[PDB]
Amino acid sequence: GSHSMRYFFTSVSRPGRGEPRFIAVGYVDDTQFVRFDSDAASQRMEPRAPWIEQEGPEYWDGETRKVKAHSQTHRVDLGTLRGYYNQSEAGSHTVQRMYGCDVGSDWRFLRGYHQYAYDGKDYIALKEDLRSWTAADMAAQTTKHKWEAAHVAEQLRAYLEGTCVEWLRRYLENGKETLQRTDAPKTHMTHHAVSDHEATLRCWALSFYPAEITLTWQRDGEDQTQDTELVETRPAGDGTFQKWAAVVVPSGQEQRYTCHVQHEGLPKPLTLRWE
Amino acid sequence: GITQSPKYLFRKEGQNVTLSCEQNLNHDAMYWYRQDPGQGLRLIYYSQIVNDFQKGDIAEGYSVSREKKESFPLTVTSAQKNPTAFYLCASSMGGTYEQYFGPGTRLTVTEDLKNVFPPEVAVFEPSEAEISHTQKATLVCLATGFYPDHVELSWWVNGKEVHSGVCTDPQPLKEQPALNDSRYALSSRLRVSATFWQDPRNHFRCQVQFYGLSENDEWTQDRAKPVTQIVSAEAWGRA
Amino acid sequence: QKEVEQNSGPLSVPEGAIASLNCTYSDRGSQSFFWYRQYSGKSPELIMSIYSNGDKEDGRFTAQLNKASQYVSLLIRDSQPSDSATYLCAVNALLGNQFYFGTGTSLTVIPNIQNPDPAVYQLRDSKSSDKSVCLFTDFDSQTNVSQSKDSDVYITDKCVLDMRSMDFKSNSAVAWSNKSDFACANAFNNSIIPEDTFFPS
């Protein structure tokens, strides 16, 4: 939708080396604003964006206690799952949780999710109606029956449809200058002589936000996906993103190829040429 | 589920007391509340997990420990200015989940044990006028002069406890409201048919359970020791 | 103010009718709303829990939630004598990871006892005919009993008994004194007494 808030939780067991490592991050759209790392020194939920720093001590004290208990729950899950799959305590395992909500143009609820993974594979997830569960294997069906008998889905829906949406609105308002911004891509093109008969054109897009972007190549105005390379979107480090797309062109006819950039800050796609 | 002992406690001011609370519900969070007559719940202490605890709103004069997951002992120190209260223990899955309370403990702290008295129970036979006007007979029972207000009243007809036709005051009544250490009174009614009270083979008894000193508590007064006891009063039928 | 607020004033409702208890809260990431019942001298008992806007029905209970207006209510259908208790509103708080209780609202249902025959009888003690008490009974629920201003005279509140042999219910209140010059005629003068109360000789 128009905006979203998402939280990511990961626990990695360390058999014979200490308690599992717990890392939690929160994101509003493409911006991270909170973190927790069990190996870090603070042992608290820490801010990672300016607009969240204005929350009072009740916020930070409460969030610290909540993620800590969350890590404790994962400590129990890591051992329980070993019994579900009859696994030994000599190997390292990881659990991953992820939830959040999407909102529409009116900042009202649109979509919710809450999914759980074990060793990198889907384990159990809340369906789109926020009222049923999707179990992967036999072990997940035991978790499903327990969470159904505990009426867990009813309580998760109240967060995803309620608190999640309400506090997403709050963050969007407190961080309007940062979250409600849109940075159009800064574009340019480079040329690289591969040999006497071929040349590579690289179409650049930099300093854009949010990360959603599309780069396509065209020859004589028709789409051309052959001999085209498209790198995955990468973070610039200052809150923006980078992406480029390349194409191999017979030497002499580079003027027949155009690059097209589609982004939220461009009402019409930008066109890039070499000459 | 969750239990707390004892149901009634009675101590002298100047020493510490320990209120126990235990639960086997595998709950991480445990809470201690106190409650005053006609008032609400007020948080004293709570614990999110073992080896941790956080001061509530009236933590002054109290202390807790959480050495194990199932136990949460509360200590009432001599610094607490008004220890007399109804103390309630609860537990929950987490900070934001519903809490389940224990049975509760009534703590009463007094200056000297010289004002501890068992109740005086009497039963009053129905008036002849009531029997001829409404064809019903109402017995009245009075427990007077007891302190503290830790009493339980029950009616017994022909050796069996009854509840139909019984009404008891919700809480005892201070005999001298202006005194901080006033003794209490309590009334109760038992209404039966006129033809039932006029049977001399029917036995009525008003039993009052009092909770006071234990047999192990020390007593240095010449007066009879106000131990936890039962006081009752009987009556037969009259034609 | 406080996080959870409910008018603690004694609410009285006729038996068999609808009893509604209101509760308002300050949003603290409030996501879960509960109702507890508490009898005199007993511990709070969880009776109702609601998580989404609308009405949740459970027997004679009905929990209503409107998060937009920050309002939780409880409706009791067919008010019975066993429903007389204090009902505590509870609201959780994801901000701070807390769980707040209201001060509670005391509810008492009044019995619709037709055929009131008010009277003030005098009952003598069983073991000693010297002591005596006065019994004001068989009056309608719209009668209120006021405590005595004399430290020598004690007066109790009204209290309802339910006979099951015959379908009969009645109010009653007791007063007594050790002055031995105190009579049953001048016992309940502090309270508003109905004009047709019978007084024996």
Binding site: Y59, T73, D77, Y99, Y123, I124, T143, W147, T163, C164 | - | -
Partner: peptide, 9 residues
């Protein structure tokens, strides 16, 4: 803000 403490599997 994060949801309440999750349930264990």
């Amino acid at each position: 803000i994060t949801d309440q403490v999750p349930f264990s599997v």
